């Protein structure tokens, strides 16, 4: 544990917990391909349990990392095409607005206008068929992007389709389980219960609710130990052993459009390196449309980039940035959704700094 680490880490995250009053948090800064770990504060504040190593956190839309590499995978093996029309994985999907609507927009937020939010009032699997049959596009596909839970959520449902697996089966056999990122869960154990940290809103402790598309597009819950081996393993995924999720991951951090200096992945977002934080430049505009520029073929992975996301649930704030090129990633988990640029801010002062 390197004193510029420890110092920088330090006196960039004491600051944030004060001004944001955040009850616990947990950090991982990877140095040179190796973990170290901080933690402060609590889990649980009315039961006085400190956060750990081994604390579970809802890592919000963090989780669509997850879902465009598993996504990617299943491009790998053949299963799913990104040029394949919406339709071939769901024929019941016959309203005419969804023709030139692929997989790839879908992934990318890109198909025409999803909604942000899938409503509450979808429940049945019936539901969701009428909720995307009678969605209308506010524009053609491939035009703009407009992020969107019911859009990537779409994707993932759909790419696990050939391979006869639920969507939780095919994210734990064919991601979590080969990473071992053994303290991973779209839904939390009994057993495990214990580490699961209670998110805080307004004061009051609150953790997600069940959704549709809710796995796919926010319902990862993972302990700051894990999400530094998914940071290593996007940093290096020619460390990984499996060769589709090697390629899989690959594929996630390919540019696919270009929206000002940002590039949209597969669940990851892109920008060159070096950029200064003004850059990044992606909070919340409750919803921001914005033209994009194909990127036609995509780029493969940049090492010279700035790879993030950030993720909300209504208790919780996490984010991810890493560096291909330096070897060098961070994952700030907290159990309090505060605002976007103060994550950003913290995380490129540190990471700045180390290299
Ligand atoms: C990912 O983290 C997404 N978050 C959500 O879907 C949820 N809340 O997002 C906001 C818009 C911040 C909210 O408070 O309503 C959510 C899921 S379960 C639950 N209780 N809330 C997207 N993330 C952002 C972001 O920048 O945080 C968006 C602007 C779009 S939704």
Same mark, same amino acid.
């Given at each position: 544990?390197?004193?510029?680490?420890?110092?920088?880490?330090?006196?960039?995250?004491?600051?944030?917990?004060?001004?944001?009053?955040?009850?616990?948090?947990?950090?991982?800064?990877?140095?040179?391909?190796?973990?170290?770990?901080?933690?402060?504060?609590?889990?649980?504040?009315?039961?006085?349990?400190?956060?750990?190593?081994?604390?579970?956190?809802?890592?919000?839309?963090?989780?669509?990392?997850?879902?465009?590499?598993?996504?990617?995978?299943?491009?790998?093996?053949?299963?799913?095409?990104?040029?394949?029309?919406?339709?071939?994985?769901?024929?019941?999907?016959?309203?005419?607005?969804?023709?030139?609507?692929?997989?790839?927009?879908?992934? $990318?937020? $890109?198909?025409?206008?999803?909604?942000?939010?899938?409503?509450?009032?979808?429940?049945?699997?019936?539901?969701?068929?009428?909720?995307?049959?009678?969605?209308?596009?506010?524009?053609?596909?491939? $035009?703009?992007?407009?992020?969107?839970?019911?859009?990537?959520?779409?994707?993932?449902?759909?790419?696990?389709?050939?391979?006869?697996?639920?969507?939780?089966?095919?994210?734990? $056999?064919?991601?979590?389980?080969? /990473?071992?990122?053994?303290?991973?869960?779209?839904?939390?154990?009994?057993?495990?219960?214990?580490?699961?940290?209670?998110?805080?809103?307004?004061?009051?402790?609150?953790?997600?609710?069940?959704?549709?598309?809710?796995?796919?597009?926010?319902?990862?819950?993972?302990?700051?130990?894990?999400?530094?081996?998914?940071?290593?393993?996007?940093?290096?995924?020619?460390?990984?052993?499996?060769?589709? /999720?090697?390629?899989?991951?690959?594929?996630?951090?390919?540019?696919?459009?270009?929206?000002?200096?940002?590039?949209?992945?597969?669940?990851?977002?892109?920008?060159?390196?070096?950029?200064?934080?003004?850059?990044?430049?992606?909070?919340?505009?409750?919803?921001?449309?914005?033209?994009?520029?194909?990127?036609?073929?995509?780029?493969?992975?940049?090492?010279?980039?700035?790879?993030?996301?950030?993720?909300?649930?209504?208790?919780?704030?996490?984010?991810?940035?890493?560096?291909?090129?330096?070897?060098?990633?961070?994952?700030? /988990?907290?159990?309090?959704?505060?605002?976007?640029?103060?994550?950003?801010?913290?995380?490129?002062?540190?990471?700045?700094?180390?290299?």
């Amino acid at each position: 544990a390197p004193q510029q680490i420890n110092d920088i880490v330090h006196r960039t995250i004491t600051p944030l917990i004060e001004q944001q009053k955040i009850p616990g948090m947990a950090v991982a800064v990877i140095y040179q391909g190796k973990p170290y770990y901080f933690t402060w504060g609590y889990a649980d504040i009315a039961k006085k349990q400190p956060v750990t190593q081994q604390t579970l956190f809802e890592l919000g839309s963090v989780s669509k990392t997850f879902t465009g590499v598993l996504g990617g995978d299943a491009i790998a093996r053949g299963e799913i095409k990104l040029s394949d029309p919406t339709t071939k994985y769901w024929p019941e999907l016959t309203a005419k607005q969804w023709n030139g609507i692929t997989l790839l927009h879908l992934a $990318t937020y $890109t198909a025409g206008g999803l909604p942000l939010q899938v409503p509450d009032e979808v429940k049945s699997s019936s539901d969701l068929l009428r909720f995307y049959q009678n969605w209308q596009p506010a524009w053609a596909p491939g $035009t703009q992007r407009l992020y969107a839970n019911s859009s990537i959520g779409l994707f993932g449902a759909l790419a696990v389709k050939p391979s006869g697996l639920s969507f939780e089966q095919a994210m734990q $056999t064919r991601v979590f389980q080969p /990473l071992k990122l053994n303290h991973t869960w779209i839904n939390v154990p009994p057993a495990e219960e214990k580490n699961y940290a209670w998110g805080y809103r307004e004061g009051k402790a609150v953790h997600v609710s069940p959704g549709a598309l809710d796995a796919e597009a926010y319902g990862v819950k993972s302990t700051i130990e894990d999400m530094a081996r998914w940071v290593q393993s996007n940093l290096k995924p020619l460390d990984i052993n499996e060769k589709t /999720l090697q390629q899989g991951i690959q594929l996630a951090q390919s540019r696919y459009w270009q929206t000002g200096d940002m590039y949209q992945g597969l669940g990851w977002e892109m920008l060159d390196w070096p950029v200064n934080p003004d850059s990044i430049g992606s909070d919340n505009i409750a919803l921001a449309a914005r033209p994009v520029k194909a990127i036609t073929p995509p780029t493969p992975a940049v090492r010279a980039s700035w790879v993030h996301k950030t993720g909300a649930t209504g208790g919780f704030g996490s984010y991810v940035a890493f560096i291909p090129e330096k070897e060098l990633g961070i994952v700030m /988990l907290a159990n309090k959704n505060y605002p976007n640029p103060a994550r950003v801010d913290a995380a490129w002062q540190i990471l700045n700094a180390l290299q």
